Scaffold this active site. Structure first.
Site, PDB file in Angstrom:
ATOM      1  N   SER A   1     -11.564  -1.274   0.683  1.00 29.09           N
ATOM      2  CA  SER A   1     -10.189  -1.070   1.035  1.00 29.09           C
ATOM      3  C   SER A   1      -9.971  -1.359   2.527  1.00 29.09           C
ATOM      4  O   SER A   1      -8.899  -1.883   2.935  1.00 29.09           O
ATOM      5  CB  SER A   1      -9.590   0.302   0.999  1.00 29.09           C
ATOM      6  OG  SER A   1      -8.689   0.495  -0.083  1.00 29.09           O
TER       7      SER A   1
ATOM      8  N   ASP B   1       0.812  -1.180   0.000  1.00 29.17           N
ATOM      9  CA  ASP B   1       0.000   0.000   0.000  1.00 29.17           C
ATOM     10  C   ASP B   1       0.889   1.292   0.000  1.00 29.17           C
ATOM     11  O   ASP B   1       1.902   1.359  -0.642  1.00 29.17           O
ATOM     12  CB  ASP B   1      -0.886  -0.141   1.241  1.00 29.17           C
ATOM     13  CG  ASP B   1      -2.171   0.566   1.117  1.00 29.17           C
ATOM     14  OD1 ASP B   1      -3.222  -0.097   0.970  1.00 29.17           O
ATOM     15  OD2 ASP B   1      -2.244   1.799   1.169  1.00 29.17           O
TER      16      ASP B   1
ATOM     17  N   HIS C   1      -3.746   5.963   4.108  1.00 26.04           N
ATOM     18  CA  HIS C   1      -4.415   4.740   3.682  1.00 26.04           C
ATOM     19  C   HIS C   1      -3.812   3.517   4.335  1.00 26.04           C
ATOM     20  O   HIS C   1      -4.506   2.842   5.042  1.00 26.04           O
ATOM     21  CB  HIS C   1      -4.450   4.617   2.122  1.00 26.04           C
ATOM     22  CG  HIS C   1      -5.509   3.700   1.566  1.00 26.04           C
ATOM     23  ND1 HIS C   1      -5.200   2.516   0.946  1.00 26.04           N
ATOM     24  CD2 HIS C   1      -6.859   3.814   1.503  1.00 26.04           C
ATOM     25  CE1 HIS C   1      -6.319   1.935   0.543  1.00 26.04           C
ATOM     26  NE2 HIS C   1      -7.340   2.699   0.877  1.00 26.04           N
TER      27      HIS C   1
ATOM     28  N   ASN D   1     -14.538  -0.447  -5.434  1.00 26.37           N
ATOM     29  CA  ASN D   1     -15.505   0.394  -4.790  1.00 26.37           C
ATOM     30  C   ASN D   1     -16.355   1.002  -5.855  1.00 26.37           C
ATOM     31  O   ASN D   1     -16.794   2.128  -5.777  1.00 26.37           O
ATOM     32  CB  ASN D   1     -14.710   1.533  -4.101  1.00 26.37           C
ATOM     33  CG  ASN D   1     -14.077   1.123  -2.818  1.00 26.37           C
ATOM     34  OD1 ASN D   1     -14.395   0.106  -2.207  1.00 26.37           O
ATOM     35  ND2 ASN D   1     -13.168   1.940  -2.377  1.00 26.37           N
TER      36      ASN D   1
END
Lengths: 279, 8
Positions: A224, A39, A69, A161
């Site tokens: 996520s 990530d 994130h 998403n």
């Protein structure tokens, strides 16, 4: 164990009914396994990671998460308070820049990387890799995920998403990995969740409190944030010796809460991640 | 294409 006033995704993952406030989990809590959070980085100094996180490789100039994130994801998979597995060891592989973007090759690269690197670590219980990221379908991206996964890592993968069919999204559609969808706390598919015949299961993804950079915390929503719940659910069960990297997904799926979620399209599974913790 | 998502 119980964590009172736990985050709801946490309470949910361990309840067979939406509504509860305690997260009940075994105490081994993920320890022994390792989770690569591929990530934006991971503020490994977050007091909430108590020292169990560490950047293992970036593909940029720093190794810092300047985004949030990843600390967030790292967070949910195994921050003390915000996490599924409070004792997992987390390694950051920074494939996404501090805006949260990445090229498919540095993520392919990050994937081939953890496949190699895991070989020189001590992750006695399994190794998971959690990819809360994604893009348009690509067969090399799928290939990378499938290499990583066949090389022995338990790849959890955000369905995406776009509230679409995850088939046109990549990792999401490497049927060999574990695409994860999101639900909200009323047991509805998260309104943004992708779905489709390729999703394998759902986890809490709406309004998720976790670690944030600055040594802070914050709720956000996404497939996520569900990924890391299966990533961490996976890790938590590998160390529980209930499944392996090669089958953590099917197993998480077979043992999930079924028919509970509302909002599921014909074609998509009505399965919600669940640890069956019986004290 | 990437965050699958948060604000940061």
């Amino acid at each position: 164990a119980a964590q009172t006033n736990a985050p709801w995704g946490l309470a949910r993952i361990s309840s067979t009914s939406p509504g509860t406030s305690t997260y009940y989990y075994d105490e081994s809590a993920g320890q022994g396994s390792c989770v690569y959070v591929i990530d934006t980085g991971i503020e490994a100094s977050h007091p909430e990671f108590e020292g169990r996180a560490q950047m293992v490789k970036t593909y940029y100039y720093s190794s810092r998460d300047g985004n949030g994130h990843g600390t967030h994801c790292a967070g949910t998979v195994g921050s003390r308070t915000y996490g599924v597995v409070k004792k997992t060891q987390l390694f950051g592989v920074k494939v996404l820049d501090d805006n949260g973007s990445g090229q498919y090759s540095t993520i392919i690269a990050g994937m081939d990387f953890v496949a190699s690197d895991k070989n020189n670590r001590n992750c006695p219980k399994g190794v998971v890799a959690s990819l809360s990221l994604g893009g348009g379908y690509s067969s090399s991206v799928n290939s990378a995920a499938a290499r990583l996964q066949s090389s022995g890592v338990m790849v959890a993968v955000a369905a995406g998403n776009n509230n679409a069919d995850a088939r046109n999204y990549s990792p999401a559609s490497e049927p060999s990995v574990c695409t994860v969808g999101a639900s909200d706390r009323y047991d509805r598919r998260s309104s943004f969740s992708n779905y489709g015949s390729v999703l394998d299961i759902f986890g809490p993804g709406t309004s998720i409190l976790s670690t944030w950079i600055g040594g802070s915390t914050r709720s956000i929503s996404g497939t996520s944030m569900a990924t890391p719940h299966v990533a961490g659910l996976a890790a938590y069960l590998m160390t529980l010796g209930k499944t392996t990297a090669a089958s953590a997904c099917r197993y998480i799926a077979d043992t999930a809460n079924k028919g509970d979620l509302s909002n599921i399209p014909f074609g998509t599974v009505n399965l919600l991640a669940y640890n069956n913790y019986q004290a | 294409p990437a965050p699958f998502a948060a604000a940061a």
